[PDB]
XYZ file of C-alpha atoms in Angstrom:
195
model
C 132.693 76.285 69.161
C 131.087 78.637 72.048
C 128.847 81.091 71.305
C 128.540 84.606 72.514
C 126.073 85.702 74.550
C 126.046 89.921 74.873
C 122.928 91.068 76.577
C 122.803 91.250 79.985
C 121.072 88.613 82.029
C 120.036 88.820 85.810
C 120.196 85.350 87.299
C 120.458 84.198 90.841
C 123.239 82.342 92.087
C 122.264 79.103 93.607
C 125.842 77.249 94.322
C 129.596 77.719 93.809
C 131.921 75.817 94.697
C 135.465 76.669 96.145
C 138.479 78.075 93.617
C 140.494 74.807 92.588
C 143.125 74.934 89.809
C 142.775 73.845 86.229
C 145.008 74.450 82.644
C 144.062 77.041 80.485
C 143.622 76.276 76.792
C 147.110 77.998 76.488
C 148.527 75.593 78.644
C 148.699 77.913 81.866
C 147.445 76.612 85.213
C 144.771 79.239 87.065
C 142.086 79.091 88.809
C 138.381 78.525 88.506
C 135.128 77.155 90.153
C 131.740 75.856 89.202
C 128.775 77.574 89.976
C 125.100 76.878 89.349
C 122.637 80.360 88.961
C 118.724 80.006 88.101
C 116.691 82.654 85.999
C 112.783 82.810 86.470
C 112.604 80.075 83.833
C 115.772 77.897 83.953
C 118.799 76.809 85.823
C 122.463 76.787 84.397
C 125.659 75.474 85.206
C 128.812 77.816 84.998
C 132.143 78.010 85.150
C 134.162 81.129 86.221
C 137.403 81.198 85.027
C 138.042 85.142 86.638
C 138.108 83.848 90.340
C 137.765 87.753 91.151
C 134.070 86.782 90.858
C 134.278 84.597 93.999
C 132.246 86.984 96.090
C 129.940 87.614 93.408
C 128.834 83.756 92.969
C 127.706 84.051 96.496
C 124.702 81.721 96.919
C 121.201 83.572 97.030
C 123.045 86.974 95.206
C 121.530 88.311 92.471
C 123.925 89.437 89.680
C 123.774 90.720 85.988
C 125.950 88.897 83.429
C 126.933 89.599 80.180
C 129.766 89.108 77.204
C 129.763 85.537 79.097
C 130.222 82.450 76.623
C 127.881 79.326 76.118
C 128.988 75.752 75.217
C 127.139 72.659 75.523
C 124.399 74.371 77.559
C 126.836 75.333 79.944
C 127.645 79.290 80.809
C 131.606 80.371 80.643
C 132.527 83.593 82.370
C 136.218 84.867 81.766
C 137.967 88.281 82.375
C 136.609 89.594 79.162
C 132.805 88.963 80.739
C 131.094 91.294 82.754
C 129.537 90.126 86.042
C 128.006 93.154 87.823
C 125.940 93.187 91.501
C 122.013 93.339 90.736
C 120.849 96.509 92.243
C 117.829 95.521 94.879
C 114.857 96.896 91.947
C 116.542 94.647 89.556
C 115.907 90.756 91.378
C 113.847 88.141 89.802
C 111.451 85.817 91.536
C 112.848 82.317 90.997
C 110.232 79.782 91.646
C 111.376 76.862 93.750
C 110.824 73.883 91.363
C 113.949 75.343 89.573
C 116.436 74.892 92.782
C 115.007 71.422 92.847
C 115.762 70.826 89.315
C 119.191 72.123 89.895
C 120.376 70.261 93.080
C 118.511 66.786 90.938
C 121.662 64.458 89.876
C 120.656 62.763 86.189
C 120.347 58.726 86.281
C 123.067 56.728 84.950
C 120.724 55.147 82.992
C 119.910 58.525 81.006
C 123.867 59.671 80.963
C 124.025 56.065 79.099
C 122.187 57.443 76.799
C 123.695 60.353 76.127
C 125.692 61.272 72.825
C 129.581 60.991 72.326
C 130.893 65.008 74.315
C 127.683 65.381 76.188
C 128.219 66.781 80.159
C 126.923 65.358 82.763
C 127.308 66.412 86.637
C 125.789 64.960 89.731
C 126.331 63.522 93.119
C 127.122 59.261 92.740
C 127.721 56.613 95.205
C 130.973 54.576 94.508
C 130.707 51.119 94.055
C 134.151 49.679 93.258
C 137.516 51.983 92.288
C 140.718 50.597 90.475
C 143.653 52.284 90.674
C 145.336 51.666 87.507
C 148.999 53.107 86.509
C 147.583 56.026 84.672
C 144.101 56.397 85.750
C 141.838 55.507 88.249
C 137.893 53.547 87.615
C 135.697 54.742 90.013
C 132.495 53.100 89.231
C 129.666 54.853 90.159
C 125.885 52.853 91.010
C 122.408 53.977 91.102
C 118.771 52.167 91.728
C 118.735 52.914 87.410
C 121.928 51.375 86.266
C 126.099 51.676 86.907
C 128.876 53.376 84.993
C 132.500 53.771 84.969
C 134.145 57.265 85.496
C 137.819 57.720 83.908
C 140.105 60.339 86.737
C 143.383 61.025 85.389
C 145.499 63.813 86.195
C 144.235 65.503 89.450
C 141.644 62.794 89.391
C 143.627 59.598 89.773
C 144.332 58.029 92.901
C 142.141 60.378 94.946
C 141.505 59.970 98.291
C 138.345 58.002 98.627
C 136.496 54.359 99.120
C 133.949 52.154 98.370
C 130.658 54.179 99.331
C 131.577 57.481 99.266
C 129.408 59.847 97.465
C 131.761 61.814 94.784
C 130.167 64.485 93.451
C 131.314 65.111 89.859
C 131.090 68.455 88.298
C 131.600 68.448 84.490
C 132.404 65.069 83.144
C 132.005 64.101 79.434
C 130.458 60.819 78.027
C 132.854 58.860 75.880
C 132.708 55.414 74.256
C 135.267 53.185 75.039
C 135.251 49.253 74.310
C 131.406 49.792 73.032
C 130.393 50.759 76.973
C 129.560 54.345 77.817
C 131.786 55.820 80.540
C 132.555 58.934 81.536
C 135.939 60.571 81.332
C 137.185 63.886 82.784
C 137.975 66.914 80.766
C 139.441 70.395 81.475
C 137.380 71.408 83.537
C 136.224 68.316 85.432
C 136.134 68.270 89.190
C 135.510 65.856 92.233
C 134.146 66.716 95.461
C 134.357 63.756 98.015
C 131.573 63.005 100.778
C 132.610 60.684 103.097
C 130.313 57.813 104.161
């Protein structure tokens, strides 16, 4: 259940990452990415399902959003949104303890914590991965505590190894055998950083 958000809002984009495919809820594969944008207050994660926008979620642009969707704190942007270019009199001053909140990845030991749907994303070491028949463990460490994260579908068998950094980019906390893991959704993307 999103909800609607129709005012405009000037935000500046921060990061984006490259268009990647994903399924629709009406079972059609198109493209998307994941962006992150900062007002003078907060930072928010996004996803842009109208990869039209690309040049628009240009980091350090200023744009004005509205008719964009909101669901679990994050921002959805689809053809029905409107994403227009800030005009220079309409930027905002966003202070830099935001970006540094934004780039921060969350401690395992507080996405342990987390309730049964909540989204997490962040940049993980990889401790151990097993490659099972129709998913792959990749357990991720941290000085606060270690977790297992469930890739099926474009996220099993992926090309990586023991201490590689994968950043994960919209992963949702599930219990399973009364341990926290996380497990990847529609949406859900890896980016690998080899080490």
């Amino acid at each position: 259940g999103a909800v609607l958000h129709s005012e405009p809002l000037t935000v500046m984009v921060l990061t984006a990452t490259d268009p990647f495919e994903y399924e629709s809820p009406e079972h059609e594969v198109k493209n998307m990415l994941h962006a992150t944008v900062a007002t003078v207050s907060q930072y928010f994660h996004v996803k842009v399902f109208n990869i039209n926008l690309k040049e628009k979620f240009t980091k350090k642009n200023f744009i004005i959003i509205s008719n964009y969707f909101e669901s679990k704190g994050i921002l959805e942007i689809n053809e029905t949104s409107s994403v227009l270019e800030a005009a220079p009199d309409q930027m905002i001053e966003v202070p830099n303890s935001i970006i540094r909140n934004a780039n921060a990845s969350p401690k395992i030991c507080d996405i342990q914590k987390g309730t049964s749907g909540a989204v997490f994303y962040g940049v993980f070491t990889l401790h151990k991965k097993t490659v099972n028949r129709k998913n792959t463990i990749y357990e991720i460490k941290d000085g606060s505590g270690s977790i297992e994260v469930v890739g099926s579908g474009k996220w099993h068998n992926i090309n990586c190894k023991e201490g590689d950094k994968l950043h994960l980019f919209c992963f949702h906390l599930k219990t399973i055998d009364r341990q926290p893991k996380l497990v990847c959704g529609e949406h859900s993307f890896i980016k690998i950083s080899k080490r």
